[PDB]
Amino acid sequence: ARVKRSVNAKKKRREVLDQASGYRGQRSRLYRKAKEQTLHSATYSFRDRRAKKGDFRSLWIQRINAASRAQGMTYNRFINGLKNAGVEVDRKMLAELAVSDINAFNSLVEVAKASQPQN
Amino acid sequence: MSKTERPSRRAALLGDRPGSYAIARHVRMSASKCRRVINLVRGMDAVDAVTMLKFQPQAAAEPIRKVIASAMANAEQTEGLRADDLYISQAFVDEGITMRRIRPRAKGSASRILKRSAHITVVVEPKEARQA
């Protein structure tokens, strides 16, 4: 029962070389280099899937800060005022408002202002 | 399989467009040295190409010229086109069989010598197809 390796062996090679189908140089042509690069790509993508939450939250916070500073309020005071007012709209929707519906955002800024400690 | 139009060189080089082609296979010259002349000859009018290759100093100018002439002759026989209204639409060089040889070096060593070959393909079409 002598078995030849090729039929079983080429499957993972085809898979890896398909996953490396935009890489530059040896990384898209040779199975060993493509395998190393796919190891790195998997590590990178797992890490960036977790870092995406923080990245998008940072972008939302920056946009909310910019839109609330045009109304004379800092981001920290705006967030504290929305917390005190009870309006639980998250930073994703707050940034969506700050871009698309700036009048609704300014009304929310007024709501946050009226709900500050003022002390 | 049981499908029509088995693949052919004409269908891949011309594909129902008027024109013709020629291939010189196993030319005992390296593919790079043939390409140095083929890059000059590609896209040119065929008669201008053969007259220029008559004067090109390179050794690969004599093979390629012949190929072009053969292509022109083919177009003058299967299509009725004249030589003066043909242009070299496509031109490329592929590698042929490379013979292995040994050159004896110093201190009992032998270095490897590769005798390379080339296949030269030239496809000619009427000049009216240059912009179409």
Binding site: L39, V89, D90, M93, N103, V111 | -
Partner: protein, 102 residues
């Protein structure tokens, strides 16, 4: 008129006739579910108080079940030999918002 609504730990900006992707619910296609509103904008009129948002009902109709992208996880650390292969799909519920009634 549109609303900021919540549906399973996530918030969406919906309008009447909007096809929205929601964290999976246990409801059959063609059934009508309700989304809890966090804000309502009717044009220069923004509803934000709890007592007024309790009156507002956002009603949507369950379209079917969709799938997220296929995710390949390959956990790897060099000079150990350690690898771990995994996959994920993350099915969702597609939903069509049919009403925002104050």
């Amino acid at each position: 008129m549109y609303a900021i609504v919540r549906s399973g730990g996530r918030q969406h900006k919906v309008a009447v006739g909007d096809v929205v992707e929601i964290d999976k619910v246990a409801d059959e296609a063609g059934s009508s579910i309700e989304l809890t509103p966090l804000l309502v904008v009717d044009g220069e009129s923004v509803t934000s108080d709890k007592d007024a948002l309790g009156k507002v009902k956002v009603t949507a109709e369950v379209l079917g079940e969709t799938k997220g992208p296929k995710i390949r996880i390959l956990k790897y650390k060099n000079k150990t030999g350690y690898k771990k292969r995994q996959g994920h799909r993350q099915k969702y519920t597609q939903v069509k918002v049919t009403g925002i009634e104050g």
